[PDB]
Design a protein around this ligand. Structure first.
Ligand SMILES: OC[C@H]1O[C@H](O[C@H]2[C@H](O)[C@@H](O)[C@@H](O[C@H]3[C@H](O)[C@@H](O)[C@@H](O[C@H]4[C@H](O)[C@@H](O)[C@@H](O[C@H]5[C@H](O)[C@@H](O)[C@@H](O[C@H]6[C@H](O)[C@@H](O)[C@@H](O[C@H]7[C@H](O)[C@@H](O)[C@@H](O)O[C@@H]7CO)O[C@@H]6CO)O[C@@H]5CO)O[C@@H]4CO)O[C@@H]3CO)O[C@@H]2CO)[C@H](O)[C@@H](O)[C@@H]1O
Length: 106
């Protein structure tokens, strides 16, 4: 029911199974073609040069607003933390939980 005040992209929710990492993200609908991904760090907290990636996809719009929902679920066996990246209209935005990124306590 609650949504982002101003961010172009912001984390709705996330979860880890031990097996599987999933979640939802708030995306500001600024242009039609989008690219929203989650980039996480090693079970050893290694970023692999931003290479541990997980593509999210459009799930549904949020009525009464200029924001929408994207979802991500994938199989991951080792993960310490992550951040969210968003590209549209040649611009990039990020959700890095105010530079600390999101820790996954597994
Ligand atoms: O794998 C299949 C498919 O993958 C890609 O498509 C992705 C998008 O990349 C991704 O962003 C997401 O789209 C969501 C979006 O996030 C939501 O906001 C919503 O979209 C709204 C949108 O916000 C509205 O503004 C409105 O869109 C207008 C648009 O503003 C206007 O420009 C025009 O769109 C044309 C566009 O400019 C052209 O580039 C072109 O694009 C074509 C591709 O060329 C063609 O190959 C094929 O993919 O279809 C594309 C779109 O048809 O033509 C566009 C029109 O034909 O008009 C639109 C309205 O038609 O409305 C939409 C809501 O309808 O929802 C979308 C998803 O529903 O998810 C999609 C789907 O996976 C990749 O871009 C695409 O090429 C691949 O086929």
């Amino acid at each position: 029911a609650s949504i982002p005040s101003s961010a172009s992209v912001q984390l709705d929710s996330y979860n880890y199974d031990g097996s599987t990492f999933s979640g939802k993200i708030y995306v500001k609908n600024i242009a039609y073609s989008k690219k929203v991904t989650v980039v996480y760090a090693d079970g050893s907290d290694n970023w692999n040069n931003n290479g541990n990636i997980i593509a999210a996809s459009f799930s549904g719009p949020i009525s009464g607003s200029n924001y929408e929902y994207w979802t991500f679920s994938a199989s991951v066996k080792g993960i310490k933390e992550f951040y969210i990246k968003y590209e549209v209209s040649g611009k990039t935005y990020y959700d890095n939980n105010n530079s600390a990124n999101y820790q996954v306590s597994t």
